[PDB]
Amino acid sequence: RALRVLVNMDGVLADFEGGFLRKFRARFPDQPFIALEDRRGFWVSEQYGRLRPGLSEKAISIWESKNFFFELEPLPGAVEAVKEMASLQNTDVFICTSPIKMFKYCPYEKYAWVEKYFGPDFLEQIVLTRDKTVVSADLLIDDRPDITGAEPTPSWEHVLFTACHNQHLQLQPPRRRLHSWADDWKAILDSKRP
């Protein structure tokens, strides 16, 4: 009876693209880079690899480094919106996020980041998983276009959160976007209420 909304972390709450670019340029100042306006495709490393050999690996080294995830800036309006959303009657919010493959820092720092911006109690709302299709909900707000896994018919509707890497993408008609946290997320939630 409560509406259940999964909110993705990187690309939705936390500015992974901006953080990556800043730290990449700082560490590899003699290398070429991709301006955010020129990003295409979800995987940063794939575009960097196309741009010259060995650059994929240098890109990966940025997000595998300590404090990369912890130091990400929140996207504008994201913390306020999620706080408001969680406080709504008949509304349960989980943060549903995937770790990178190297697990030394990323799990820990994602929990740390949520504590920082949402408080200790909000840690109870974190679902860390590589497969979001096995998490049941009414809505998943996520910047990644292709959300696949072991469940062929997830219970949620995937609402595509706009990011630099996806802003030009034409989606299969029934599919919907949340263009930013200034956009009308309440109306999206309301369209799903019983």
Residues in the site for its own copies, rule: CB under 8 A?
Answer: 2, 4, 92, 94, 99, 101, 103-104, 107-108, 111-112, 115, 120, 123-131, 134-137, 150-151, 155
Query: In the chain, what is the straight-line distance between the N-terminal and C-terminal CA atoms, in Å?
Result: 8
Q: Tell me which of Mg ion, its own copies, ligand T3P, none is bound by residue 155, counting a contact when its beta carbon lies within the kind-specific cut-off of 5 to 8 angstroms.
A: its own copies
Among 3, 78, 94, 98, binds ligand T3P (CB under 6 A): 98
For 51, counting Cβ atoms within 10 Å of its Cβ (0-12 exposed, 13-18 middle, 19+ buried), the class is middle
| One-letter identity of residue 113 | W
Neighbours of 47 (CB within 10 A): 18
Quick one: 115 or 183, whose CB is closer to its own copies? 115
Binding window for ligand T3P (CB under 6 A); candidates: 4-12, 48-56, 84-92, 145-153: 4-12
Least Cβ distance, residue 10 to Mg ion (angstroms): 4
Tokens 């495709």 sit at which residue?
41
How far is the C-alpha of 97 from the C-alpha of 107, rounded, in Å? 10
Torsion angles phi and psi, residue 166, rounded to 5: -120, 0
Residues forming contacts to ligand T3P in the complex (CB under 6 A) are 8-11, 16, 43-45, 97-98, 100
